[PDB]
Design a binder for this molecule. Structure first.
Ligand SMILES: *P(=O)(O)OCC(C)(C)[C@@H](O)C(=O)NCCC(=O)NCCOC(=O)[C@@H](N)CC(C)C
Length: 515
């Protein structure tokens, strides 16, 4: 869970009085010692509500290690002859695509503007190195009677898909179209690479499209890192000089499967976490009374738009202060604000919000390529006329309770809860809230000037998806990915603007009742 990691970071920063606390920063190297160790332990106990001690800090002196310490066997490499293993999370992504026919909605884009036009032959060679390094990028998925079956292509058998595209109209719409193009994972590797050039394009835009089964947003940094390494090596006519991965995704999947156990085992983590979610999601609403422009259609088209709400740096910093002062993450502030927004729009006091949680505590997978996101239903209650500060306490309690049962795959949770189904409605929740941080130090890739560019998606996965997105070099914005079937664009622009308004009011005076 990344949430533990940012809480430990916020605690390190406050105690050491430093603004440079990263997930890999050693507490004692940061300037800490035994005296300040007591203050870190005391603050983490009051915030996290778990019995943490000096021992945990000593053995795990970095936020990533300490967070992982609070979250199960370590991932072990299974040897070269081991067959591929699809994780439960991958199986869930395969199910939603087959059962709900989401076409291209789950494709993950990663677009980088490059001041130089890249060499297509070197890029293709580098993509082959990237695919050879990360087995998940050359793992096909084929249907069967039992379900999906992984098929690991050998590096020499994985035909990479690398092509240059000349941009006619605006580049942003081309990026969205290329992203929406569906994969056939039975015959194509889950990676498409496109270099967009044109008279309007200065240099090129490098677009990586991954099928979600093979990458999450947390994979952007290792993707660009490794692709840059391979491109530079291939431009010099050599193979990239890198060590093997400490673990492949199949290693992570096998370890997760063995630890989860069988749902029929009363002592297995799977059944115990499923039992929690069965109780926690009792009497859940089928859906929230949101203000749509059109009724929910019989079948979902999964068309969508993207409405941005720019946040002034002073608002981003005020939101950070509000999170730090109440001992919550920025995500919890955003999640609380979204709950207030839907509440003020008439959704009631019982607000289920879907949210991704990253299962990247193990150091063998903490910085690797793959899909490590589970989906949790964060059920926030707004009854009793709470203030926003009160809500931040409720949200923290709901989230921490949820983060302790984050391994039960969301599809098993849907099976256990058994809500009424509808192919045009995502079950258990239809609004997702997430916090995302884009990679830093990706400005000099491929020996050029580079910058990430956001892709304006033409697809949507739920009714509403709110994302607080930090760019990695200072700024932040809210991205609302809305279902076009339900909302017009201007309704979504208004929705994302009213969320910023709620955030502005919460920072100004968190003691206002949310009603
Ligand atoms: P954190 O890891 O930074 O902890 C700080 C210290 C330095 C470990 C702190 O615990 C500490 O001061 N340890 C020192 C303990 C120590 O050295 N005691 C000396 C023993 O003195 C006596 O007890 C005395 N009876 C010695 C006899 C042999 C005469």
């Amino acid at each position: 869970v990344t949430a533990y990691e940012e809480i430990v970071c916020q605690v390190f920063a406050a105690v050491l009085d430093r603004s440079d606390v990263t997930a890999d920063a050693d507490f004692f190297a940061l300037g800490g010692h035994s005296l300040l160790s007591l203050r870190v332990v005391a603050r983490l106990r009051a915030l996290l509500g778990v019995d943490v001690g000096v021992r945990d800090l000593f053995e795990a002196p970095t936020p990533a290690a300490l967070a992982a310490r609070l979250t199960r066997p370590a991932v072990t490499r299974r040897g070269p002859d081991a067959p591929p293993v699809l994780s439960h999370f991958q199986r869930g992504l395969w199910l939603i695509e087959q059962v709900y026919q989401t076409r291209g909605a789950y494709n993950v884009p990663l677009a980088v503007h490059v001041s130089d036009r890249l060499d297509l032959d070197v890029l293709r060679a580098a993509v082959r190195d990237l695919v050879a390094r990360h087995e998940v990028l050359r793992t096909l998925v084929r249907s069967s009677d039992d379900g999906p079956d992984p098929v690991l292509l050998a590096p020499e058998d994985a035909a990479v898909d690398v092509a240059e595209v000349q941009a006619a109209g605006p580049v942003a719409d081309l990026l969205a179209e290329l992203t929406a193009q569906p994969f056939d994972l039975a015959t194509q590797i889950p990676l498409r690479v496109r270099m967009i050039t044109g008279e309007q394009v200065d240099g090129c835009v490098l677009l990586l499209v991954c099928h979600h089964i093979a990458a999450d947003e947390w994979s952007f940094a290792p993707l660009l890192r490794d692709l840059d390494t391979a491109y530079r090596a291939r431009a010099a006519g050599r193979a990239p000089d890198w060590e093997p991965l400490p673990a492949q995704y199949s290693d992570y999947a096998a370890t997760l499967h063995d630890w989860l156990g069988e749902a029929t085992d009363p002592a297995s983590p799977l059944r115990r976490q499923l039992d929690y979610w069965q109780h926690a999601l009792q009497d859940l609403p089928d859906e929230l009374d949101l203000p749509t422009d059109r009724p929910r259609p019989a079948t979902a088209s999964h068309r969508g738009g993207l409405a941005r709400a720019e946040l002034p740096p002073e608002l981003v910093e005020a939101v950070r202060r509000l999170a730090a002062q109440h001992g919550v993450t920025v995500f919890m502030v955003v999640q609380a604000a979204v709950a207030v927004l839907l509440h003020r729009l008439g959704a009631g006091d019982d607000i289920p919000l879907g949210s991704p949680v990253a299962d990247r505590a193990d150091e063998a997978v903490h910085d690797t390529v793959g899909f490590f996101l589970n989906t949790l239903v964060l059920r926030v209650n707004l009854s009793g006329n709470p203030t926003f500060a009160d809500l931040l306490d409720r949200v923290r309690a709901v989230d921490l309770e949820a983060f302790a049962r984050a391994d039960a795959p969301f599809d098993a949770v849907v099976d256990t809860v058994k809500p009424p189904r509808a192919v045009s409605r995502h079950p258990l929740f239809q609004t997702m809230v997430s916090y995302q941080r884009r990679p830093s130090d990706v400005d000099r890739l491929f020996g050029a000037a580079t910058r990430l560019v956001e892709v304006p998606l033409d697809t949507a996965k739920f009714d509403l998806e709110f994302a607080f997105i930090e760019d990695g070099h200072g700024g932040a914005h809210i991205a609302l990915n809305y279902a076009a079937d339900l909302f017009d664009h201007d309704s979504a622009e208004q929705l994302v603007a009213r969320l910023r308004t709620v955030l502005e009011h919460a920072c100004a005076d968190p003691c206002r009742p949310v009603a």
